[PDB]
A paper describes a structure:
TupA is a globular protein with approximate dimensions of 55.7 × 34.5 × 23.8 Å. The protein has a butterfly shape with a central beta strand (T77-P89) that supports two lobes (lobe A: A2-R76 and Y201-E251; lobe B: A91-Q200). The TupA metal binding site is located in a central cleft assembled by the two lobes. In DaG20 TupA, the cleft is decorated with positively charged residues as seen by the electrostatic surface potential calculations. Moreover, one chloride anion, arising from the crystallization conditions, was found at 3.8 Å from R118, indicating the propensity of the pocket to attract negatively charged ions. In this GsTupA-W6+ holo form, the central cleft volume (363.9 Å3) is four times smaller than the apo form of DaG20 TupA here reported (1480 Å3). The apo-form model was created by refining the initial BUNCH model with the SREFLEX program. The SAXS data corroborate the hypothesis that DaG20 TupA is a flexible protein that is able to adopt a loose conformation in the free form but, when binding to molybdate or tungstate, switches to a more compact fold.
The present work reports the 1.40 Å crystal structure of the recombinant apo-form of TupA protein from the sulfate reducing bacteria Desulfovibro alaskensis G20 (DaG20 TupA) together with the biochemical characterization of three variants: R118K, R118E and R118Q. X-ray crystallography and SAXS, reveals that TupA architecture has a common feature with other substrate binding proteins, which is the existence of two separate lobes.
Author numbering: 2 to 251
Write the structure that this text describes.
C-alpha cells in the first residue's frame, strides 16, 4: 500500500491545495501521499536528512543549491501562486495599475505608509527583494516604513488601521476580504507583475544521497502533477471561490 513522504511548506499547507490533490493522486496512482509542512529551510533539511522522498517548495535559489549539493535530482516547475500590493481604495499614492517598481517608488516618493512583516518570513524576504529593484534607496530607515514583526493577517490589519499599503500573498488577502463580507477597506492595487510570482517546484530526493528513497513513487507524483489533467485541476482550484494557482509545467 505504497506511501510517498513529502516535505513542504507551512504556506503550502495553509492553501489547502494538497488536501484536494492528495485523494485524487491516490485514486489515480494507488500511492498514498503523506506530507509534513514546515518552514522552507527545515523542509530542505528534511530532504538532506533523508527523512522524505520529495520536496514541494517555492524557493528557487535554495532549491538550486539543494540540487547542486546532490541532495535532489532536479527541480520540476509545476505552478505558481502570487503576491499583491494592497492599499486603501482611495489609493492616496495613486499606484493602482502601476508596475511593482513604479508603485514602490511612488509610495517612497510620496512618503506613503508601507507596512512590512519585519519577521524574516518567506513573505518578508519577498517584500525586501522587491525594494531591491527600485532605483531609489532602501526604505528601512524611513518613518513611513512600518515593520510589524507579526504575521500576515496582523500586518494587513495594521495597514488598514494606518491607511497604508502592504504586500501580501493573495491567499491571505482572499481570506481577509471574506472576513469583511467582500468589502474590506484595502483593495488589490498592484498585481500581475512577473516579479510577484511564487514559483513552485517538485524535487525528488536523490538516491545517491539517500539510497533507500522511494524515487519511483516520487517520480510518479511529478509525472502526475505535470500531466495536463492535474495542471487543469491545479488551475481550477479555488480558495473561497477565487483562483490561486496558475499551472505552468513545461
Ligand atoms: Cl507603471
Ligand atoms: Cl502569517
Ligand atoms: Na522620503
Amino acid at each position: 500500500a505504497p506511501v510517498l513522504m513529502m516535505a513542504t511548506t507551512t504556506s503550502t499547507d495553509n492553501t489547502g491545495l494538497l488536501d484536494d490533490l492528495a485523494p485524487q493522486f491516490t485514486k489515480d496512482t494507488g500511492i498514498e501521499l503523506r506530507w509534513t509542512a514546515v518552514g522552507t529551510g527545515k523542509a530542505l533539511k528534511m530532504g538532506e536528512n533523508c527523512d522524505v522522498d520529495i520536496l514541494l517548495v517555492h524557493a528557487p535559489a535554495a532549491e538550486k543549491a539543494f540540487v547542486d549539493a546532490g541532495f535532489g535530482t532536479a527541480r520540476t516547475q509545476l505552478m505558481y501562486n502570487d503576491f499583491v500590493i494592497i492599499g486603501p481604495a482611495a489609493d492616496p499614492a495613486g499606484v493602482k495599475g502601476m508596475t511593482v517598481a513604479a508603485a514602490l517608488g511612488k509610495i517612497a516618493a510620496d512618503n506613503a505608509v508601507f507596512v512590512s512583516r519585519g519577521d524574516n518570513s518567506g513573505t518578508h524576504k519577498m517584500e525586501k527583494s522587491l525594494w531591491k529593484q527600485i532605483e531609489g534607496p532602501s526604505p528601512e530607515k524611513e518613518a513611513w516604513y512600518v515593520q510589524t514583526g507579526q504575521g500576515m493577517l496582523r500586518t494587513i490589519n495594521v495597514a488598514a488601521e494606518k491607511g497604508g499599503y502592504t504586500m501580501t500573498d493573495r491567499g491571505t488577502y482572499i481570506k481577509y476580504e471574506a472576513s469583511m463580507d467582500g468589502n474590506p477597506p484595502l483593495k488589490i492595487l498592484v498585481e500581475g507583475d512577473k516579479i510577484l510570482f511564487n514559483q513552485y517546484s517538485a524535487i525528488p530526493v536523490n538516491p545517491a544521497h539517500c539510497p533507500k528513497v522511494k524515487k519511483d513513487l516520487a517520480d510518479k507524483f511529478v509525472n502526475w502533477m505535470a500531466s495536463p489533467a492535474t495542471q487543469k485541476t491545479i488551475g481550477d482550484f479555488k480558495l473561497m471561490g477565487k483562483a490561486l494557482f496558475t499551472p505552468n509545467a513545461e
